[PDB]
């Protein structure tokens, strides 16, 4: 039986102790009986949980280990812990999907500004789905070391801050939609304005 790893087990007591060989390693009890009729209870009391187990013996005469499967033994017992039902009063696939879905609203209106005219740091395509900004750089093919670090900024020439990014191939995906994105690779920098919704 496997309890939660979070809480420490205070105590435990089974009835008819001399018919059950059980040892514990900090949250798991390895149970095995010793005779054919040792049916009892076992009660585990942790810091915040309380378990009442009802120990049985269902396979005793088996010669082949498939016969204990059909008799109904349980190799492992694990407990799942739900959250409180007052929070349940408060799913359709993954939230980050780099393809274009049928039922998501996209915003294809972004600019770029940089000193050099034709750079290898200019993104190919930038858009978002309302929740993630999908910077795509898979047409600046030549320099193999062309992968930047993306920051974000609330005004045009304010001080930038940090974002969480995940990447899929050549697509850099930024967690969250921002007014400005800043793309740096050393001394060369490319800004990215999201244009205002008219």
């Amino acid at each position: 039986v496997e309890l939660s790893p979070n809480e420490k087990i205070l105590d435990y007591s089974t009835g008819f102790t001399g018919g059950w060989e059980l040892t514990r390693r900090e949250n798991v009890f390895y149970l095995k009986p010793k005779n054919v009729d040792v049916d009892t209870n076992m009660m585990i009391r942790t810091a915040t949980h309380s378990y009442i187990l009802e120990l049985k013996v269902v396979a005793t005469d088996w010669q082949r280990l498939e016969q204990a499967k059909q008799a109904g033994v349980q190799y492992k017992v694990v407990f799942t812990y739900p959250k409180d039902t007052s929070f349940n009063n408060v799913k359709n696939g993954p939230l980050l999907n780099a393809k274009i879905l049928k039922d998501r609203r996209y915003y294809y209106d972004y600019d770029y500004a940089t000193r050099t005219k034709k750079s290898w740091l200019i993104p190919s395509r930038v858009y978002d789905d309302g929740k993630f900004t999908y910077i795509n750089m898979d047409l600046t093919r030549f320099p193999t070391g062309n992968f930047p670090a993306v920051f974000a900024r609330e005004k045009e020439h304010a001080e930038d801050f940090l974002v969480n990014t995940t990447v899929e191939g050549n697509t850099l995906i930024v967690h969250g939609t921002y007014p400005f994105l800043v793309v740096r690779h050393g001394d060369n920098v490319v800004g990215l304005r999201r244009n205002k919704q008219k």
Partner: protein, 111 residues
């Protein structure tokens, strides 16, 4: 005496997601172009990799080997017969004739 910050951008604000006006035609089914790289040095090593990259056999029947020269770097054909014709026009001064007997390459002196 203060600290120099990171570099800052500045420019024209061109727009990223830009359709073009020329419908560039991307091919789907690309054949093999017989051509002459600068890597394969001599005439024999170039024809050993035309036969290998096309499933043919090479019968090089010359007592010596010739290096690749200037006018060799103009052959670019998806046809083996037109490339063996343009090759033998280059190496005509040394008596080198290259032809294809429909399953294999023949390198023999000119009659």
């Amino acid at each position: 005496c203060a600290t120099k910050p990171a570099p800052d951008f500045g420019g024209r604000w061109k727009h990223v997601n830009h359709f073009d006006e020329a419908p560039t035609e991307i091919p789907l089914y690309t054949s093999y172009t017989y051509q002459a790289t600068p890597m394969d040095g001599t005439l024999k090593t170039m024809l050993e990799r035309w036969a290998a990259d096309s499933n043919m056999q090479l019968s090089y029947n010359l007592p010596s080997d010739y290096t690749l020269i200037g006018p060799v770097s103009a052959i670019s054909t998806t046809s083996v017969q037109q490339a063996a014709t343009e090759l033998s026009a280059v190496y005509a001064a040394q008596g080198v004739s290259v032809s294809v007997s429909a399953n294999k390459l023949l390198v023999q002196p000119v009659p």
